[PDB]
From a paper:
Pleuromutilin (PLM) antibiotics inhibit bacterial protein synthesis by binding to the large ribosomal subunit at the peptidyltransferase centre (PTC) and preventing the requisite positioning of the A- and P-site tRNA for peptide bond formation. Instead, the Vga- and Lsa-type proteins mediate resistance to PLMs and other protein synthesis inhibitors by target protection; they bind to the ribosome to drive antibiotic release, although the precise mechanism by which the latter occurs remains to be clarified. Sal(A) is revealed as but one member of a larger group of Sal-type ABC-F proteins that is likely ancestral to the genus, and which shows considerable variation in the ability to mediate resistance to antibiotics. From a mechanistic perspective, we have established that they do indeed function as target protection proteins to mediate resistance to PLM and other antibiotic classes; like other ARE ABC-F proteins, they bind into the E site of the 70S ribosome to effect dissociation of bound drug molecules.
Numbering used by the authors:
A (entry chain R): 2 to 90
B (entry chain 2): 2 to 44
C (entry chain C): 2 to 275
The structure:
RNA sequence: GAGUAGCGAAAGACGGGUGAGAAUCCCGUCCACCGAUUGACUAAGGUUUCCAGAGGAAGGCUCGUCCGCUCUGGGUUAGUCGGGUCCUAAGCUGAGGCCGACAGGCGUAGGCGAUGGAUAACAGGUUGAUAUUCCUGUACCACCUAUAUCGAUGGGGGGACGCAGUAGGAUAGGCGAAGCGUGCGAUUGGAUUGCACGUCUAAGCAGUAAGGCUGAGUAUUAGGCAAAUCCGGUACUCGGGCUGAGCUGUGAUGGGGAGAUCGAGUCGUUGAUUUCACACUGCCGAGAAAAGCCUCUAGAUAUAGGUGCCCGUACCGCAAACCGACACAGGUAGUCAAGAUGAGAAUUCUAAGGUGAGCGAGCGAACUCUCGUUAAGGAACUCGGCAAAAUGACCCCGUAACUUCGGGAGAAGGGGUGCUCUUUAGGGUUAACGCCCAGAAGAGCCGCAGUGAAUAGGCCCAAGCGACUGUUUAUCAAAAACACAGGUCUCUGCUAAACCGUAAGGUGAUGUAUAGGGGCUGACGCCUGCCCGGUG
RNA sequence: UGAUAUUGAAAUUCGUGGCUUUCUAACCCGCACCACUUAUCGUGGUGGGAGACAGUGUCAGGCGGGCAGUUUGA
């Protein structure tokens, strides 16, 4: 594990403004805690984490020829760093 | 004028719903019936 | 006695009330109270099985001692108190150990005097003891019916019975309704009359004061329809066009007797009177 | 049918701009409308309607360059907010159990279950879209590691509770100031402290604080399922604790400001429907439980660094996002709520803030609707004064029969009410001045009219019915019908009668003949005659 | 409301049968105490009360608009 916890990073306007500070955003597994997201970011990137905030997002409607269908439900986590940087590039 | 049907999330699931249905021998008959018709929602 | 009101309003025109001059304290003893949620004439199934019961004031149950058990240990009356659940007042008696419990207050006990139980006590107001030890001609109350169970007869305000005779193991006695009956000689009773003798001369006065007591209104059978009552139907006002008046379930309800035969108390009762 | 009915309550105008196209979109100015709400919050319910770019097929009762509509990109951050890892009520379930053709019904211990009890965070800044959640500052709570005590699964205390009434202490808020800050100073006849605004900042810590409650010691022991130093009794002497709004400091040396990097934050007075608080007094209708919490014993062996999970969090929310098939004149719990006028949360006009109603332009026929006025008469109208008109506030003088002595009563019927100037008695707060709240007498001045607008009973005489407040045919009947307080008859001795059910289990009732069930009558006053042959 | 089954014992009495008494072993107690046991359920033990009655099955008679199904000319 610890690579099942993290799925992919988020890259938008509000997230690039957050890594002007030391705040990094990922999209994580929908069944994990704060304390697993914190102990998985150091095992992968070797940083020192100061905090983790999590959000649950619900499925959104989406049509293609006016159809049924919902997007996946999401869980994204903002981690603050005390020591280091994550160059996700 | 007040109308019938003032909605209520918690009343709805306690009077109609899976666990209520599966509690009675006649509620399991409802759910069997809807399965052999092939309804997409059973409760 | 009976506080009478001035006719300031049509509501309080002819309305009376007790003065409560006997009640010494006005707050229960906290360690002797239970909750009493209303069950307003509705049974297991949730259906109304008794008419005219409803929503009154909220009440707590006080734990009354109807079987006087502590024998040969004196008790001093500490307080006379108000009980919402019965028509009589109650007394708090402190034992010589430090054990408090309520008692139904007799007609003539004041705060301070002592009481006691058992088959060796004085024949005076407040005492309890078996019926073989009571001299003929005493008025008693709180009379047991099976030994050990507790008293069941003569527990309303102003209620008493007096001993009449003695058989081998039974005892003759006449109840408040004038019926004569023999009770087993091992069943206790208390000496005196139940207090609160002026409870019956109260004039309730309002419709809304009987709603405070928990009584709900009565519709006469005559003003119903034929699917509701045998008395329903008719042009305007009608007489009872039947040989006998009937109840809302169709039984005869004036003069027709309802006590059931082959009872084990058919031996024990001597002179009948309702 | 027919280019006919309708286009769903209410005010817009013009200028500029954008565009292929403008009454309808965006910006501006003026004008209007709500303001105990057409404002600000927040439950429920709805589920992406929220935000930014782009679009004009359909939806929108017109148009549309626009949108709650279409397109593709985004947006919801918590040890302390609300819920779970805490408690229980009604109810719902229930090992064994009891009952029953089957199916199953009931029920014990034990569990589930808030609309209640418990429970540690505040102020400021910030985005197009979130914030007691992010950021800055300052906190508090639980646990963990470094550097006698624990204590019931059990006992006791506590928690812990109704309704009404008045007085008081505070504080929030409002108001006024030649108190002081800032920023103006007039082109219409005048004037120049003259005109407008501003006048402060938490939790936490540690101090003292109106008010409210109330003897404290020692010895002892037949009770609290065993125990007890705790509780409950008894005998004795002798007669300061535990709660509580506010206020002061200091926070924090910062933060916010009417404004020009600097920048004032005084005094007086009115004051709550908030808080002290169900406190205190009174009444009878006699007013939850359980845990946290504090003790008792059965028993048992003080600074320095860290750790803190899950779910909700967007937006609408008296509404075009909710229930009414609609962007529908209806319905939808709770909190906040300024100024003038007033008893007022009434009335009329305004503030903070929001809005101008998703078809218009003309013309000013009949007839229909909603509103205003009317000579002379004044109910002649009509089934019927139906509808309309008239009364209407505060003050003073006055007031009939009849009565159950309470009433009738605002009975009736009259008079006053604007402004200016003199002089006159006091009552809140303060050392005074001040600052508020009220009165009396006189002399004048103006008009058709002085509660000059708005809002605010028409009265009287006599008769029938029901005493009275109350209830009822959701959607043609509100009453003389139903309730009722009181009266009477009757059944019922307790596993009570009565009622529900096949029974078991229940209600009655944790009641006990001054109690309970049923029939009739219907306050109170004076009374209630005859018949027991027939039916019960 | 009777007969009969569950249902037994001893006596007195007048005709092997009935009647009435009394006794207790069956049956009953929404009855006290003690265990299971944290328990106002239940089951078991122990005292008391009642007792061959009552309750329960089968068969029989009365009552029975409380409730059903129907008829009520041309």
């Amino acid at each position: 594990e610890a690579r099942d916890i993290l799925k992919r990073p988020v890259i938008t306007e509000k997230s690039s403004e957050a890594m002007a500070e030391d705040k990094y955003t990922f999209d994580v597994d929908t069944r994990v805690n704060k304390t697993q997201v914190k102990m998985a970011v150091e095992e992968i990137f070797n940083v020192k984490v100061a905090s983790v905030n999590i959000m649950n997002y619900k499925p959104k409607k989406k049509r293609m020829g006016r159809y049924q269908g919902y997007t996946n439900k999401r869980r994204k986590a903002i981690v603050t760093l005390k020591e280091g940087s994550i160059d996700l590039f | 004028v007040k109308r019938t049907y003032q909605p209520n999330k918690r009343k709805h699931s306690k009077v109609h719903g899976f666990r209520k249905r599966m509690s009675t021998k006649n509620g399991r008959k409802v759910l069997a019936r809807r399965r052999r018709k092939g309804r997409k929602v059973l409760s | 006695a009976i506080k009478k009101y001035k006719p300031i309003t049509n509501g309080r025109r002819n309305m009376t009330s007790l003065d409560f001059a006997e009640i010494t304290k006005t707050t229960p003893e906290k360690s002797l109270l239970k909750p009493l949620p209303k069950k307003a004439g509705r049974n297991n199934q949730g259906k109304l099985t008794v008419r005219h019961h409803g929503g009154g004031h909220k009440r707590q149950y006080r734990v009354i001692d109807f079987k006087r058990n502590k024998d040969g240990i004196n008790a001093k009356v500490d307080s006379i108190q108000y009980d919402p659940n019965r028509s009589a007042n109650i007394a708090l008696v402190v034992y010589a150990d430090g054990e408090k419990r309520y008692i139904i207050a007799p007609k003539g006990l004041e705060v301070g005097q002592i009481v006691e139980s058992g088959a060796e006590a004085d024949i005076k107001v407040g005492n309890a003891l078996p019926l073989q030890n009571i001299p003929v001609g005493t008025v008693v109350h709180n009379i047991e019916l099976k030994p050990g169970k507790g008293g069941q007869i003569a527990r309303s305000a102003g209620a008493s019975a007096q001993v009449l005779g003695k058989e081998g193991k039974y005892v003759l006695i006449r109840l408040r309704s004038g019926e004569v009956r023999m009770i087993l000689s091992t069943c206790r009773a208390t000496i005196g009359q139940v207090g609160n003798l002026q409870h019956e001369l109260v004039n309730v006065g309002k419709a809304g004061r009987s709603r405070w007591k928990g009584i709900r209104p009565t519709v006469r059978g005559s003003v119903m329809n034929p699917n509701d009552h045998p008395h329903g139907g008719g042009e305007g006002r009608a007489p009872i066009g039947r040989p006998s008046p009937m109840s809302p379930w169709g039984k005869p309800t004036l003069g027709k007797k309802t006590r059931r035969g082959k009872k084990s108390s058919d031996k024990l009762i001597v002179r009948g009177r309702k």
